[PDB]
PDB file of C-alpha atoms and ligand atoms in Angstrom:
ATOM      1  CA  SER A   1      -5.066  72.828   7.490  1.00 55.86           C
ATOM      2  CA  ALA A   2      -8.310  73.574   5.650  1.00 55.45           C
ATOM      3  CA  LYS A   3      -7.824  70.435   3.532  1.00 50.64           C
ATOM      4  CA  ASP A   4      -7.449  68.230   6.664  1.00 47.40           C
ATOM      5  CA  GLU A   5     -10.630  69.847   8.032  1.00 48.05           C
ATOM      6  CA  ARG A   6     -12.395  69.299   4.701  1.00 46.59           C
ATOM      7  CA  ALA A   7     -11.384  65.621   4.603  1.00 46.20           C
ATOM      8  CA  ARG A   8     -12.935  65.125   8.056  1.00 47.15           C
ATOM      9  CA  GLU A   9     -16.187  66.836   7.019  1.00 46.94           C
ATOM     10  CA  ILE A  10     -16.524  64.592   4.025  1.00 47.90           C
ATOM     11  CA  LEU A  11     -15.875  61.475   6.157  1.00 49.06           C
ATOM     12  CA  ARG A  12     -18.350  62.664   8.777  1.00 47.64           C
ATOM     13  CA  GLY A  13     -21.068  62.975   6.108  1.00 46.56           C
ATOM     14  CA  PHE A  14     -20.255  59.691   4.290  1.00 49.90           C
ATOM     15  CA  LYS A  15     -21.976  56.314   4.669  1.00 49.67           C
ATOM     16  CA  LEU A  16     -21.692  53.181   2.595  1.00 53.98           C
ATOM     17  CA  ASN A  17     -25.132  51.633   2.731  1.00 54.70           C
ATOM     18  CA  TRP A  18     -24.819  48.364   0.812  1.00 55.75           C
ATOM     19  CA  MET A  19     -22.770  46.567  -1.725  1.00 56.14           C
ATOM     20  CA  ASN A  20     -22.692  43.425  -3.757  1.00 56.86           C
ATOM     21  CA  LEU A  21     -20.433  41.475  -6.131  1.00 60.76           C
ATOM     22  CA  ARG A  22     -21.470  39.538  -9.266  1.00 58.79           C
ATOM     23  CA  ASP A  23     -19.815  37.314 -11.857  1.00 60.80           C
ATOM     24  CA  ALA A  24     -19.535  39.766 -14.745  1.00 62.77           C
ATOM     25  CA  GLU A  25     -20.007  37.019 -17.380  1.00 61.58           C
ATOM     26  CA  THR A  26     -23.123  35.426 -15.810  1.00 62.37           C
ATOM     27  CA  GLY A  27     -24.477  38.214 -13.556  1.00 64.30           C
ATOM     28  CA  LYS A  28     -24.783  35.751 -10.659  1.00 64.13           C
ATOM     29  CA  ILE A  29     -24.477  37.366  -7.186  1.00 64.46           C
ATOM     30  CA  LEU A  30     -21.402  36.113  -5.286  1.00 64.15           C
ATOM     31  CA  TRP A  31     -21.527  38.358  -2.247  1.00 63.88           C
ATOM     32  CA  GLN A  32     -23.596  41.084  -0.671  1.00 63.17           C
ATOM     33  CA  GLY A  33     -23.417  43.023   2.570  1.00 61.49           C
ATOM     34  CA  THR A  34     -24.749  46.029   4.449  1.00 58.81           C
ATOM     35  CA  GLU A  35     -21.705  46.515   6.726  1.00 56.92           C
ATOM     36  CA  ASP A  36     -20.007  49.823   6.033  1.00 58.37           C
ATOM     37  CA  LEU A  37     -16.592  48.491   5.036  1.00 60.88           C
ATOM     38  CA  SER A  38     -15.364  52.074   4.524  1.00 61.47           C
ATOM     39  CA  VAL A  39     -15.190  52.802   8.280  1.00 61.69           C
ATOM     40  CA  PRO A  40     -11.550  53.491   9.170  1.00 62.12           C
ATOM     41  CA  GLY A  41      -9.503  52.274  12.116  1.00 60.98           C
ATOM     42  CA  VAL A  42     -11.083  48.828  12.587  1.00 59.59           C
ATOM     43  CA  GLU A  43     -10.210  45.708  10.634  1.00 59.75           C
ATOM     44  CA  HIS A  44     -13.303  44.557   8.808  1.00 62.05           C
ATOM     45  CA  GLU A  45     -13.829  40.918   7.778  1.00 64.02           C
ATOM     46  CA  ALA A  46     -15.636  39.508   4.787  1.00 67.17           C
ATOM     47  CA  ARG A  47     -16.349  35.981   3.638  1.00 68.60           C
ATOM     48  CA  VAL A  48     -16.515  35.436  -0.122  1.00 67.54           C
ATOM     49  CA  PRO A  49     -17.099  32.282  -2.125  1.00 64.48           C
ATOM     50  CA  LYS A  50     -13.871  30.747  -3.381  1.00 68.09           C
ATOM     51  CA  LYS A  51     -15.287  30.524  -6.906  1.00 68.75           C
ATOM     52  CA  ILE A  52     -14.822  34.307  -7.159  1.00 68.96           C
ATOM     53  CA  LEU A  53     -11.133  33.540  -7.802  1.00 69.61           C
ATOM     54  CA  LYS A  54     -12.162  31.710 -11.013  1.00 68.56           C
ATOM     55  CA  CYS A  55     -14.130  34.736 -12.364  1.00 69.02           C
ATOM     56  CA  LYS A  56     -12.441  36.490 -15.259  1.00 70.33           C
ATOM     57  CA  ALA A  57     -14.247  39.646 -14.153  1.00 71.43           C
ATOM     58  CA  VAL A  58     -16.274  40.768 -11.155  1.00 70.98           C
ATOM     59  CA  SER A  59     -18.993  43.438 -11.172  1.00 73.01           C
ATOM     60  CA  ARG A  60     -19.349  45.519  -7.995  1.00 73.99           C
ATOM     61  CA  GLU A  61     -22.316  47.693  -6.970  1.00 76.28           C
ATOM     62  CA  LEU A  62     -21.610  49.913  -4.114  1.00 75.66           C
ATOM     63  CA  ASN A  63     -24.423  52.262  -2.719  1.00 76.41           C
ATOM     64  CA  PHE A  64     -23.292  55.319  -0.734  1.00 73.69           C
ATOM     65  CA  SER A  65     -24.662  58.536   0.774  1.00 73.06           C
ATOM     66  CA  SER A  66     -22.752  61.802   1.206  1.00 73.28           C
ATOM     67  CA  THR A  67     -23.870  65.004   2.901  1.00 69.66           C
ATOM     68  CA  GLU A  68     -20.875  66.751   1.356  1.00 67.15           C
ATOM     69  CA  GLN A  69     -20.410  67.697  -2.250  1.00 66.43           C
ATOM     70  CA  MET A  70     -17.367  66.092  -3.891  1.00 64.76           C
ATOM     71  CA  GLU A  71     -15.702  67.229  -7.094  1.00 65.17           C
ATOM     72  CA  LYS A  72     -13.947  63.967  -7.998  1.00 67.90           C
ATOM     73  CA  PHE A  73     -14.848  61.072  -5.720  1.00 65.95           C
ATOM     74  CA  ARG A  74     -12.569  58.097  -6.428  1.00 68.19           C
ATOM     75  CA  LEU A  75     -11.027  55.026  -4.850  1.00 68.31           C
ATOM     76  CA  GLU A  76      -7.624  53.421  -4.800  1.00 68.77           C
ATOM     77  CA  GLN A  77      -7.568  49.781  -3.708  1.00 68.35           C
ATOM     78  CA  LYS A  78      -4.550  47.581  -2.991  1.00 69.22           C
ATOM     79  CA  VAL A  79      -4.737  43.807  -2.646  1.00 70.21           C
ATOM     80  CA  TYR A  80      -2.207  42.696  -0.045  1.00 69.02           C
ATOM     81  CA  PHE A  81      -1.098  39.113   0.534  1.00 71.70           C
ATOM     82  CA  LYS A  82       0.831  38.690   3.770  1.00 71.35           C
ATOM     83  CA  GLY A  83       1.707  42.370   3.540  1.00 72.35           C
ATOM     84  CA  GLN A  84       2.752  42.354  -0.109  1.00 74.41           C
ATOM     85  CA  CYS A  85       0.836  44.372  -2.664  1.00 77.17           C
ATOM     86  CA  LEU A  86      -0.191  42.039  -5.496  1.00 78.39           C
ATOM     87  CA  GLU A  87      -2.511  44.402  -7.311  1.00 78.48           C
ATOM     88  CA  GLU A  88      -3.633  48.054  -7.327  1.00 76.43           C
ATOM     89  CA  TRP A  89      -7.023  49.164  -8.694  1.00 76.51           C
ATOM     90  CA  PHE A  90      -8.313  52.683  -9.467  1.00 75.13           C
ATOM     91  CA  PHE A  91     -11.982  53.640  -9.757  1.00 72.55           C
ATOM     92  CA  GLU A  92     -13.513  57.078 -10.443  1.00 76.39           C
ATOM     93  CA  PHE A  93     -17.015  58.158  -9.548  1.00 75.68           C
ATOM     94  CA  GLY A  94     -16.659  61.913 -10.240  1.00 75.32           C
ATOM     95  CA  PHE A  95     -19.105  64.554  -9.031  1.00 77.65           C
ATOM     96  CA  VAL A  96     -21.196  63.825  -5.970  1.00 75.18           C
ATOM     97  CA  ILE A  97     -24.240  65.992  -5.202  1.00 74.53           C
ATOM     98  CA  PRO A  98     -24.464  67.085  -1.545  1.00 72.98           C
ATOM     99  CA  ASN A  99     -27.029  65.041   0.435  1.00 71.04           C
ATOM    100  CA  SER A 100     -27.320  62.463  -2.335  1.00 69.37           C
ATOM    101  CA  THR A 101     -27.475  58.685  -2.279  1.00 68.16           C
ATOM    102  CA  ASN A 102     -25.799  57.019  -5.259  1.00 68.40           C
ATOM    103  CA  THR A 103     -25.212  53.558  -6.748  1.00 66.94           C
ATOM    104  CA  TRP A 104     -21.784  53.013  -8.292  1.00 66.73           C
ATOM    105  CA  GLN A 105     -21.088  50.080 -10.614  1.00 65.71           C
ATOM    106  CA  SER A 106     -17.499  49.052 -11.273  1.00 67.47           C
ATOM    107  CA  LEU A 107     -15.775  46.242 -13.152  1.00 67.61           C
ATOM    108  CA  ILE A 108     -12.858  44.391 -11.555  1.00 69.71           C
ATOM    109  CA  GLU A 109     -10.847  42.442 -14.186  1.00 68.84           C
ATOM    110  CA  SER A 110      -1.206  36.853 -13.021  1.00 66.74           C
ATOM    111  CA  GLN A 111      -2.196  33.342 -11.881  1.00 68.20           C
ATOM    112  CA  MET A 112      -4.323  33.194  -8.723  1.00 69.12           C
ATOM    113  CA  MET A 113      -3.057  31.301  -5.645  1.00 71.04           C
ATOM    114  CA  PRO A 114      -5.452  28.649  -4.279  1.00 72.98           C
ATOM    115  CA  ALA A 115      -8.257  29.864  -2.017  1.00 73.53           C
ATOM    116  CA  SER A 116      -6.835  27.710   0.792  1.00 70.77           C
ATOM    117  CA  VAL A 117      -3.562  29.629   0.696  1.00 72.51           C
ATOM    118  CA  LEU A 118      -5.184  33.041   0.302  1.00 70.83           C
ATOM    119  CA  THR A 119      -7.877  32.743   2.962  1.00 69.50           C
ATOM    120  CA  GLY A 120      -7.329  35.040   5.950  1.00 70.86           C
ATOM    121  CA  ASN A 121      -4.083  36.297   4.346  1.00 73.23           C
ATOM    122  CA  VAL A 122      -5.642  38.798   1.910  1.00 74.04           C
ATOM    123  CA  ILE A 123      -6.187  42.405   3.044  1.00 75.04           C
ATOM    124  CA  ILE A 124      -7.941  44.918   0.799  1.00 74.19           C
ATOM    125  CA  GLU A 125      -6.794  48.441   1.614  1.00 72.70           C
ATOM    126  CA  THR A 126      -9.173  51.077   0.212  1.00 74.84           C
ATOM    127  CA  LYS A 127      -8.384  54.795   0.089  1.00 75.03           C
ATOM    128  CA  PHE A 128     -11.371  57.282  -0.555  1.00 72.70           C
ATOM    129  CA  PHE A 129     -10.329  60.444  -2.261  1.00 74.86           C
ATOM    130  CA  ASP A 130     -11.978  63.616  -3.423  1.00 76.19           C
ATOM    131  CA  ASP A 131      -9.507  64.339  -6.192  1.00 78.71           C
ATOM    132  CA  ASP A 132      -6.129  64.413  -4.369  1.00 79.77           C
ATOM    133  CA  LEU A 133      -7.653  64.864  -0.904  1.00 80.68           C
ATOM    134  CA  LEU A 134      -7.452  61.626   1.152  1.00 81.60           C
ATOM    135  CA  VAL A 135     -10.752  61.233   2.986  1.00 82.02           C
ATOM    136  CA  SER A 136     -10.164  57.848   4.585  1.00 80.87           C
ATOM    137  CA  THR A 137      -8.309  54.552   4.558  1.00 84.31           C
ATOM    138  CA  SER A 138     -10.124  51.291   5.474  1.00 83.78           C
ATOM    139  CA  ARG A 139      -9.009  47.640   5.585  1.00 82.11           C
ATOM    140  CA  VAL A 140     -10.964  44.428   4.982  1.00 84.20           C
ATOM    141  CA  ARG A 141      -9.549  40.924   5.621  1.00 82.56           C
ATOM    142  CA  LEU A 142     -10.885  38.314   3.216  1.00 83.47           C
ATOM    143  CA  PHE A 143     -11.739  34.657   3.836  1.00 81.96           C
ATOM    144  CA  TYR A 144     -12.519  32.432   0.881  1.00 83.47           C
ATOM    145  CA  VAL A 145     -15.257  29.949   1.754  1.00 84.46           C
TER     146      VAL A 145
HETATM  147  N1  9GD B   1      -4.128  38.717  -7.805  1.00 84.10           N
HETATM  148  C1  9GD B   1      -5.044  38.416  -6.875  1.00 84.10           C
HETATM  149  C2  9GD B   1      -6.154  39.245  -6.670  1.00 84.10           C
HETATM  150  C3  9GD B   1      -7.113  38.932  -5.695  1.00 84.10           C
HETATM  151  C4  9GD B   1      -8.237  39.764  -5.471  1.00 84.10           C
HETATM  152  N2  9GD B   1      -9.368  39.194  -6.212  1.00 84.10           N
HETATM  153  C5  9GD B   1      -9.644  39.942  -7.484  1.00 84.10           C
HETATM  154  C6  9GD B   1     -10.408  39.042  -8.461  1.00 84.10           C
HETATM  155  C7  9GD B   1      -9.703  37.696  -8.625  1.00 84.10           C
HETATM  156  C8  9GD B   1     -10.411  36.817  -9.648  1.00 84.10           C
HETATM  157  N3  9GD B   1     -10.376  37.549 -10.936  1.00 84.10           N
HETATM  158  C9  9GD B   1     -11.115  38.827 -10.851  1.00 84.10           C
HETATM  159  C10 9GD B   1     -10.484  39.750  -9.813  1.00 84.10           C
HETATM  160  S1  9GD B   1     -10.835  38.929  -5.181  1.00 84.10           S
HETATM  161  O1  9GD B   1     -11.868  38.115  -5.920  1.00 84.10           O
HETATM  162  O2  9GD B   1     -10.443  38.214  -3.901  1.00 84.10           O
HETATM  163  C11 9GD B   1     -11.645  40.470  -4.716  1.00 84.10           C
HETATM  164  C12 9GD B   1     -11.028  41.306  -3.802  1.00 84.10           C
HETATM  165  C13 9GD B   1     -11.640  42.491  -3.427  1.00 84.10           C
HETATM  166  C14 9GD B   1     -12.884  42.824  -3.948  1.00 84.10           C
HETATM  167  S2  9GD B   1     -13.617  44.326  -3.444  1.00 84.10           S
HETATM  168  O3  9GD B   1     -12.509  45.352  -3.490  1.00 84.10           O
HETATM  169  O4  9GD B   1     -14.702  44.660  -4.441  1.00 84.10           O
HETATM  170  N4  9GD B   1     -14.354  44.325  -1.725  1.00 84.10           N
HETATM  171  C15 9GD B   1     -13.547  45.109  -0.770  1.00 84.10           C
HETATM  172  C16 9GD B   1     -14.021  46.414  -0.642  1.00 84.10           C
HETATM  173  C17 9GD B   1     -14.900  46.983  -1.567  1.00 84.10           C
HETATM  174  C18 9GD B   1     -15.324  48.288  -1.397  1.00 84.10           C
HETATM  175  C19 9GD B   1     -14.864  49.008  -0.306  1.00 84.10           C
HETATM  176 CL1  9GD B   1     -15.368  50.579  -0.109  1.00 84.10          CL
HETATM  177  C20 9GD B   1     -13.995  48.447   0.616  1.00 84.10           C
HETATM  178  C21 9GD B   1     -13.565  47.142   0.440  1.00 84.10           C
HETATM  179  C22 9GD B   1     -14.713  43.137  -0.948  1.00 84.10           C
HETATM  180  C23 9GD B   1     -14.701  41.879  -1.674  1.00 84.10           C
HETATM  181  C24 9GD B   1     -15.510  41.060  -0.666  1.00 84.10           C
HETATM  182  C25 9GD B   1     -16.322  42.017   0.199  1.00 84.10           C
HETATM  183  C26 9GD B   1     -16.156  43.293  -0.547  1.00 84.10           C
HETATM  184  C27 9GD B   1     -13.512  41.998  -4.869  1.00 84.10           C
HETATM  185  C28 9GD B   1     -12.890  40.806  -5.246  1.00 84.10           C
HETATM  186  C29 9GD B   1      -6.916  37.766  -4.940  1.00 84.10           C
HETATM  187  C30 9GD B   1      -5.799  36.944  -5.158  1.00 84.10           C
HETATM  188  C31 9GD B   1      -4.838  37.240  -6.131  1.00 84.10           C
HETATM  189  C32 9GD B   1      -3.715  36.398  -6.348  1.00 84.10           C
HETATM  190  O5  9GD B   1      -2.721  36.834  -6.984  1.00 84.10           O
HETATM  191  O6  9GD B   1      -3.677  35.206  -5.934  1.00 84.10           O
END
């Protein structure tokens, strides 16, 4: 279908360039990377400091480029522990100019399991939408260090 073709064009033109996480209260950087975690079909890995689990809120900056125009770029993210969804998050970016590079700031705000239990057992599944069109699904396995 035209929508399936369109999804592939958007993916083809998309790159996640860099990204970081900060304690929202203090602004202190907890993690940063330049690996494109959005790439589908391979299991990505990331190592994050265990103190992140003590943050009431985490600020994420995500820098991306897109050759394709998007009407309503957004993300759905599911936190899975041993295959069980503990949490679902929704973030909206909105309009994306074709051939632009953009920085997107988001706030991520139950009782947390210990880092030692969680480590290597947490998968973040991220879906990349333009409105209702699914562009891609990626997975990142988290280790708490
Ligand atoms: N309920 C739980 C939720 C989590 C997930 N954490 C969310 C934090 C937990 C501490 N309070 C603030 C929210 S987290 O700190 O581990 C966290 C997870 C994902 C992310 S992320 O979605 O921003 N990102 C994944 C990501 C981001 C963007 C894209 Cl495109 C793809 C993947 C990763 C984090 C490390 C490398 C980047 C940020 C923080 C863990 C355990 C439990 C539990 O019940 O025990």
